Amino acid sequence: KTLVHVASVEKGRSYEDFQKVYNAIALKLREDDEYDNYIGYGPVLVRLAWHTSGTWDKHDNTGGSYGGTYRFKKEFNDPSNAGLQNGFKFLEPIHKEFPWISSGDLFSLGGVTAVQEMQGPKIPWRCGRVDTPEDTTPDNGRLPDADKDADYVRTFFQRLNMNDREVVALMGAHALGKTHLKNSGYEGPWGAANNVFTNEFYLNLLNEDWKLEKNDANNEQWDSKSGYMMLPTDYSLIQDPKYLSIVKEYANDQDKFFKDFSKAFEKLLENGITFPKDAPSPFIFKTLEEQGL
Numbered sequence: 001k002t003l004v005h006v007a008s009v010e011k012g013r014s015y016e017d018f019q020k021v022y023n024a025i026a027l028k029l030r031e032d033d034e035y036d037n038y039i040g041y042g043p044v045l046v047r048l049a050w051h052t053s054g055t056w057d058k059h060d061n062t063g064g065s066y067g068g069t070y071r072f073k074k075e076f077n078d079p080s081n082a083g084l085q086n087g088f089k090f091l092e093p094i095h096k097e098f099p100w101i102s103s104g105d106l107f108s109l110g111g112v113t114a115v116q117e118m119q120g121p122k123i124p125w126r127c128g129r130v131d132t133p134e135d136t137t138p139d140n141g142r143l144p145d146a147d148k149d150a151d152y153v154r155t156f157f158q159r160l161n162m163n164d165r166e167v168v169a170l171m172g173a174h175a176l177g178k179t180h181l182k183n184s185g186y187e188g189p190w191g192a193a194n195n196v197f198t199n200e201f202y203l204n205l206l207n208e209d210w211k212l213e214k215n216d217a218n219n220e221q222w223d224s225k226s227g228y229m230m231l232p233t234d235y236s237l238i239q240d241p242k243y244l245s246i247v248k249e250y251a252n253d254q255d256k257f258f259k260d261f262s263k264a265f266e267k268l269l270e271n272g273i274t275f276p277k278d279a280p281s282p283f284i285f286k287t288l289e290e291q292g293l
């Protein structure tokens with residue numbers, strides 16, 4: 001039923017070459033700090049890594065991070081991907097300096113570098129995604145809608161082979177960045193610390209006083225008097241009793257949430273890829289701070 005995508009290391013490259021790419025991304029994150037009203041590019045890079053991987057379908061191995069297909073117009077213009085052009089334009093000069101890295105390796109490594117540089121967990125990362133042609137680009141409509149309930153979320157993520165814990169852990173990336181009305185029809189940040197990776201999304205779900213309101217695009221979202229919001233699908237994590245347990249867990253254990261996020265995010269970025277037996281081990285890149293850079 002299933003196409004095989006075998007990881008193929010970019011020729012002669014090793015951990016040091018990819019740490020250089022990581023560094024170039026991390027230094028540009030630091031440099032281009034004004035983006036999106038001084039949020040910086042971290043959040044949108046995490047989202048680009050996710051949306052370029054989250055097209056995967058476990059049933060037939062279509063979509064997924066391997067082929068780097070977001071570079072093709074059908075996927076770049078998915079209405080679900082509105083806004084990610086900013087992440088892509090950010091990665092352009094990185095790809096020009098390191099033209100030997102594949103597009104899938106760069107889009108996934110952009111997400112890993114962003115989470116780490118924003119003081120999140122270390123995320124092991126494996127190289128070897130290989131660009132595939134335009135006709136392998138998955139159709140629009142594989143990424144999730146925001147107006148739905150917990151049952152939708154649970155069913156949706158079964159296609160990406162994620163269970164409840166992985167779903168709840170991945171959603172904590174909504175600590176980061178904001179919704180922008182012109183992109184998605186929702187507006188506002190989920191919390192205060194939105195370029196530093198913490199478990200604030202679960203603390204705010206449980207602790208803020210949320211009101212169900214309509215925003216200026218006439219879509220419902222949950223809002224707090226702190227100026228934060230939650231999408232219907234975020235709020236569903238405290239409406240469903242199974243998800244709520246795991247929300248309370250991560251609101252109360254930052255290390256657990258980091259460890260679970262790191263595994264789920266690595267899995268998301270690797271779904272669909274076959275690693276040969278003698279492939280290199282996953283790399284754990286040092287942050288700029290760890291290197292004194």
Ligand code: HEM
Binds near residue numbers: 147153
């Ligand atoms: C039910 C699943 C999800 C839904 C419906 C959803 C929906 C959305 C929406 C509507 C936005 C705002 C886009 C904009 O207006 O710019 C957004 C932003 C964001 N999403 Fe999600 N999301 C989901 C899951 C995830 C996951 C799994 C991750 C990564 C692990 C993620 C990471 C992010 C990040 C980092 C942003 C902020 C982007 C920025 O600030 O530019 N999301 N999401």
